Design a protein around this ligand. Structure first.
Ligand SMILES: [Zn+2]
Ligand SMILES: [Zn+2]
Ligand SMILES: [Zn+2]
Length: 944
């Protein structure tokens, strides 16, 4: 058999399914959400693919593996080692960038280290080396009275164990050795791990720059230069480093010893920018809080940290308190008196101000304030003053910004001076990294370069240069041309992240692999779709075999074989509805998929659309943030708006970092940092903002649908207030798995335990003591309508909904969860196991569980995610419902149906990153399909 075969897969609601798949095909898994698609694809097939292979690695890791919950199948075979390509992790670590993620940056450092020449930062003369003598002369010329410790870094972070070395240093007695930070009396050194890299510097002298101490000055400096390989580092008291091999000709100091490849890593201290330490950024309070038009009243407030009841009454007073005392009152707009504004911001006059207050009873007749409560110090103060979430709440008046020293570049300047001489500029590695598009970098690295990669360096760095462009190549291929090497890894969308992984994997040149991909058409424009299907195929064609969980027409159309997964949701699914070619699937009358796919079903374009109100329009003005080009954009209120456009066009920066962040500030009063812009129009036409993020519901198995929606409180009471419970004296609290009495003590009531996996990813294994119940057995003695807590927590929501039809206080929450489509989800199903869409959808069911006051605004970022056709159809009703109450709903989408249904679309582009951040078209679908310049328009037009 050239076949992948599975018998009796039972992993979740999977009903002992058997499959006979064509290896060396692009297989696509398909069906309604919560069909079991993923349990089969990822939890069983892949999971086993990986496992069986890894078991080989070492007979040891074979044990470390033993402690996994091997997926529940009976027999599988024709199984290639598997590799997952989902969109699960968007790690927030600051230092890590595309460059780093793709290892491309790594190669860059080798390329720079070993070809292309360094320069001094100021004088700039090609950089020479330097004789111990004129290193003694530099230091002799120093400031008299300066005191510094001649220090010699014999070991610059290399690894070893240095017992022999410590002796040779007690051999001429030092007693002052710093290793790995901590200082050790060189009589008594520490034992070192030969395995860990190390940092051993001996103090050679504590000195001072007297004229005629020249003898010890000269006599120490030569010794350190000798003992630590020509490196002295004098570390002052009133540090500066000197290298034998790297020197400004004209005697400027250079703050970096070797030009070694690490010296480029803004992760190593050696290259990293000293100020921000290669973080690139500094959190730094903007003068931005404000609104220039409003000023100082309670109804008219100016200075944002100072707008309340007691806080507001208190500071307004003190402003005008100095405001006839500097002549600016409390009734001029912020953009009004230049002298006046610099006051509340800086320290200004610093003249005691008259503060009048009513005493504890009424007494009054006291007090001043030693200070104009200097505003930018209210900040430093209160960030310090109250330890809390509040601290981040105050942080909301600061803005990450590039570091002035390192220019944002996260780099020690001397490094920035190293230079690859190709065409217009021998741009720094960072100049190359910060290049606008992958193509921008590829062009210089790929062409502008080899053709002046000199005959010495072609021999020593030529291969490296090749390895780089190959890699840039594949990036273009996955259509990532538009981002830059230097972009932060965390910022990239799940799609973008995934699209990268695909570039890495496709390049890997691996054959015989089973790649299991999770919905890669996500966050990808309809345009780039047929492009990606190619890269997918060429991945198969290389000699691999794919399984793609998907609901996209084109991808499915293009599949070699299709498994359609049990019809219905949860219990109702988990069976192989279809498994065969595309045509054959169309024939299948039981495929909900086939229905839509054949045409028996569709989502129909509303014959009468919602009409837009010009007078009632929410408007972002002058959006400057990232690639947005100071645009003005108006979203019509009380209607369905899709923001569309290709990946990288600013869809997110607009709607999320600016449009949403403002509304959260102006309607729900979070103190959250909106992306740089001018302002937002009207806005008082709205009660509140609902941002249905796709972020996880919770990071712990503590968070549950029962918890999150808060139905569990209402159930814990239904339980405590029961015949069996009261006879035992059980309060509502015991039924809370969060709370010391009644929850199992081994899991602390989570039900499962996160067992660290080392090379493989960490995974939850059900607790042995509990079996994953959450509760100790005595607590489970208690029933309600013949079901314990664990049982009722285990119910599908759809199931629990019928079960609680009686208590309509609880039934409300459950109906909306069923309405939102999550019927199939288990009431107390650990939050970490929810798909970003499910999580999104749960949050959505929380606001549905509220009074729909006809002027609230909903922001749905890719709500289409992880949904089947039919699922979309259901969801759209939920949305029109919402909008028919006259609520405003704004949606970022690539999905055609959703777009073709919207009443208004805003199309950003034209391209991604640098090209883009403009409005390519806006109007009704009909209008936009009309704009020939619009990509969204192109596709939209085939449907309109
Ligand atoms: Zn210089
Ligand atoms: Zn910096
Ligand atoms: Zn337990």
């Amino acid at each position: 058999a050239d076949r992948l075969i599975v018998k009796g897969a039972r992993e979740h609601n999977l009903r002992s399914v058997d499959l006979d798949l064509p290896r060396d095909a692009l297989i696509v898994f398909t069906g309604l959400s919560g069909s079991g698609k993923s349990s089969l694809a990822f939890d069983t097939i892949f999971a086993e693919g990986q496992r069986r292979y890894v078991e080989s690695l070492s007979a040891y890791a074979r044990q470390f593996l033993g402690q996994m919950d091997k997926p529940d199948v009976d027999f599988i075979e024709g199984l290639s080692p598997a590799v997952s390509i989902d969109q699960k992790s968007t790690n927030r670590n600051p230092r890590s960038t595309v460059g780093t993620i793709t290892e491309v940056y790594d190669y860059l450092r080798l390329l720079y280290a070993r070809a292309g020449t360094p320069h001094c930062p100021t004088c700039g003369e090609r950089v020479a080396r330097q004789t111990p003598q004129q290193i003694v002369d530099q230091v002799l010329a120093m400031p008299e009275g300066t005191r510094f410790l001649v220090l010699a870094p014999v070991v610059r972070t290399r690894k070893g164990e240095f017992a022999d070395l410590f002796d040779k240093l007690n051999a001429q007695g030092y007693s002052r050795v710093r290793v790995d930070g901590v200082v050790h009396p060189l009589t008594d050194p520490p034992k070192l791990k030969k395995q860990e890299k190390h940092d051993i510097e001996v103090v050679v002298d504590r000195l001072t720059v007297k004229a005629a101490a020249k003898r010890r000055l000269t006599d120490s400096v030569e010794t350190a230069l000798n003992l630590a390989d020509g490196i002295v580092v004098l570390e002052f008291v009133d540090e500066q480093r000197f290298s034998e091999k790297l020197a400004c000709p004209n005697g400027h100091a250079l703050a970096v010893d070797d030009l070694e490849p690490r010296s480029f890593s803004f992760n190593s201290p050696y290259g990293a920018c000293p100020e921000c330490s290669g973080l690139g950024i500094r959190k730094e309070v903007d003068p931005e809080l404000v609104v220039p038009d409003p000023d100082r009243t309670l109804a008219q407030g100016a200075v944002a940290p100072w707008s309340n009841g007691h806080t507001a009454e208190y500071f307004t007073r003190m402003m005008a308190g100095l405001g006839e005392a500097l002549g600016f009152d409390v009734d001029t707009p912020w953009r009004k008196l230049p002298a006046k504004a610099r006051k509340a911001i800086l320290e200004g006059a610093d003249e005691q101000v008259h503060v009048r207050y009513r005493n504890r009873y009424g007494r009054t007749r006291s007090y001043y304030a030693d200070f104009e409560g200097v505003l930018a110090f209210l900040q430093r103060k209160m960030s310090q003053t109250e330890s809390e979430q509040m601290k981040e709440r105050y942080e909301g008046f600061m803005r990450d910004v590039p570091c002035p020293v390192c220019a944002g570049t996260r780099l020690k300047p001397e490094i920035l001076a190293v230079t690859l001489a190709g065409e217009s500029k021998g741009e720094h590695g960072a100049k190359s990294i910060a290049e606008v598009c992958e193509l921008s970098i590829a062009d210089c690295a790929d062409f502008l370069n080899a053709l002046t990669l000199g005959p010495r360096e072609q021999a020593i760095a030529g291969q490296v240069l090749k390895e780089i462009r190959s890699r840039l190549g594949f990036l273009l291929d996955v259509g990532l041309e538009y981002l830059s090497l230097s972009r932060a890894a965390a910022t990239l969308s799940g799609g973008e992240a995934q699209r990268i992984r695909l570039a890495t994997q496709i390049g890997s040149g691996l054959v015989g692999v089973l790649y299991v991909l999770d919905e890669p058409s996500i966050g990808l424009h309809q345009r780039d779709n047929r492009r990606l299907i190619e890269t997918l195929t060429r991945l198969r064609d290389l000699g691999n075999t794919l399984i793609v969980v998907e609901h996209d027409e084109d991808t499915i159309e293009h599949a070699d074989w299709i498994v359609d997964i049990g019809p219905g949701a949860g219990e109702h699914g988990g069976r192989i509805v279809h498994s065969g070619p595309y045509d054959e699937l169309l024939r299948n009358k039981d495929s909900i998929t086939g229905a839509y796919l054949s045409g028996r079903e569709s989502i129909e374009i509303p014959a009468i659309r919602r009409s837009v109100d010009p007078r009632r329009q929410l408007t972002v003005v002058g959006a400057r943030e990232h690639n947005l080009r100071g645009i003005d954009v108006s979203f019509p209120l009380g209607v369905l708006t899709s923001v569309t456009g290709v990946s990288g066009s600013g869809k997110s920066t607009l709607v999320n970092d600016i449009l949403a962040a403002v509304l959260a500030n102006r309607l729900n009063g979070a103190r959250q940092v909106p992306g740089r812009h001018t302002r937002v129009t009207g806005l008082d036409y709205l009660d509140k903002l609902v941002r249905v993020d796709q972020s996880p519901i919770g990071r712990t198995p503590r968070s549950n649908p029962a918890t999150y929606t808060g139905v569990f409180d209402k159930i814990r009471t239904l339980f405590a207030a029961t015949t069996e419970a009261k006879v035992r004296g059980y309060q509502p609290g015991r039924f809370s798995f969060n709370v010391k009495g009644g929850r199992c003590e081994a899991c602390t009531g989570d039900g499962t335990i996160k067992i660290e996996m080392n090379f493989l990813p960490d995974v939850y294994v059900p607790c042995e003591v509990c079996q994953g119940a959450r509760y100790n057995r005595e607590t489970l003695e208690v029933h309600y309508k013949g079901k314990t807590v664990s049982e009722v927590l285990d119910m599908s929501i759809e199931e629990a909904a019928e079960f609680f039809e009686p208590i309509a206080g609880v039934h409300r929450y459950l109906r909306t969860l069923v309405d939102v489509g999550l019927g199939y989800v288990r009431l107390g199903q650990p939050a970490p196991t929810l798909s970003g869409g499910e999580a999104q959808r749960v949050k959505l069911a929380s606001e549905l569980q509220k009074r729909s006051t006809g002027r609230t605004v909903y922001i749905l970022d890719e709500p289409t995610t992880g949904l089947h056709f039919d699922d979309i159809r259901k969801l759209l009703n939920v949305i029109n419902g919402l909008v028919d109450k006259g609520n405003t709903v704004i949606v970022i989408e690539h999905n055609l149906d959703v777009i073709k249904t919207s009443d208004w679309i805003i199309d950003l582009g034209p391209e991604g990153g640098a090209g883009g951040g403009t409005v390519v078209a806006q109007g009704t679908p009909e209008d936009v399909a009309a704009v020939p310049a619009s990509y969204t328009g192109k596709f939209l037009a085939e449907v309109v």
